[PDB]
Amino acid sequence: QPQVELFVKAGSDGAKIGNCPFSQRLFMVLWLKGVTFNVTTVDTKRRTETVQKLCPGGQLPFLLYGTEVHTDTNKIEEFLEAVLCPPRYPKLAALNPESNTAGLDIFAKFSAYIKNSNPALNDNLEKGLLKALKVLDNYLTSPLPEEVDEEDEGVSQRKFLDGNELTLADCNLLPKLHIVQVVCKKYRGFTIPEAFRGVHRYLSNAYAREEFASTCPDDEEIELAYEQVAKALK
Numbered sequence: 101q102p103q104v105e106l107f108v109k110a111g112s113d114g115a116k117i118g119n120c121p122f123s124q125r126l127f128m129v130l131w132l133k134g135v136t137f138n139v140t141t142v143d144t145k146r147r148t149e150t151v152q153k154l155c156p157g158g159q160l161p162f163l164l165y166g167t168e169v170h171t172d173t174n175k176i177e178e179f180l181e182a183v184l185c186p187p188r189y190p191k192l193a194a195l196n197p198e199s200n201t202a203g204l205d206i207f208a209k210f211s212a213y214i215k216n217s218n219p220a221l222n223d224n225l226e227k228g229l230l231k232a233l234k235v236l237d238n239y240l241t242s243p244l245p246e247e248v249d250e251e252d253e254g255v256s257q258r259k260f261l262d263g264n265e266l267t268l269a270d271c272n273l274l275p276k277l278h279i280v281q282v283v284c285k286k287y288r289g290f291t292i293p294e295a296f297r298g299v300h301r302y303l304s305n306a307y308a309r310e311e312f313a314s315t316c317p318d319d320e321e322i323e324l325a326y327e328q329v330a331k332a333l334k
């Protein structure tokens with residue numbers, strides 16, 4: 101097994117895990133694979149000569165596998181899924197393609213809502229975020245093919261996006277939903293409605309798994325990363 105080293109964004113002290121959902125996605129994938137790996141945080145503004153040499157372009161996160169440097173989170177994940185494979189490592193790819201797209205617009209709707217400083221658009225952007233979350237809720241309550249005609253009628257009982265196991269689809273979405281919750285609670289008085297039972301059951305099962313909970317940056321780090329844009333709305 102070649103050396104596996106993930107290089108991620110450092111936080112406010114230039115050392116701890118900082119806000120970065122792409123870094124958390126890859127941290128979750130490696131943890132779920134069961135591979136032996138190392139994580140090195142990078143102060144993007146005070147880089148080491150080693151990091152400056154490995155990745156001169158400045159991209160973060162990045163992965164060192166053996167002697168090669170891999171950039172672009174989507175491509176790093178595709179590589180890891182392919183080279184860390186059965187029988188030694190579990191296959192993490194979702195079986196249902198729709199699991200890879202469910203809720204992916206939530207993060208962009210959140211970004212528009214949190215960066216906005218026009219008071220006349222606050223309600224519209226909040227409605228946009230709520231609607232995107234409802235679509236994810238519909239995916240989570242809709243029975244997957246595995247559950248065909250399987251307890252309430254037409255209501256799914258699975259733990260995660262694609263079934264009862266964490267997949268690459270959850271690795272991408274969960275770090276983004278974590279940021280949405282922490283930032284909106286702190287600066288918008290916003291919480292995901294309790295009526296979205298599919299979303300809350302999913303988050304409940306997800307936070308009970310150390311692969312997600314233990315890869316989260318501290319709340320303070322996320323709040324500090326969004327402080328400037330989120331406080332603009334007066």
Ligand SMILES: Cc1cc(Nc2ccc(O)cc2)nc(Nc2ccc(O)cc2)n1
Nearest residue numbers: 281299300301303304305307308313316
């Ligand atoms: C750090 C952390 C831990 C945590 N743990 C948890 C949540 C639900 C549960 O039944 C058992 C444990 N829950 C959250 N967030 C949360 C919990 C429930 C929800 O419905 C939505 C978010 N955040």
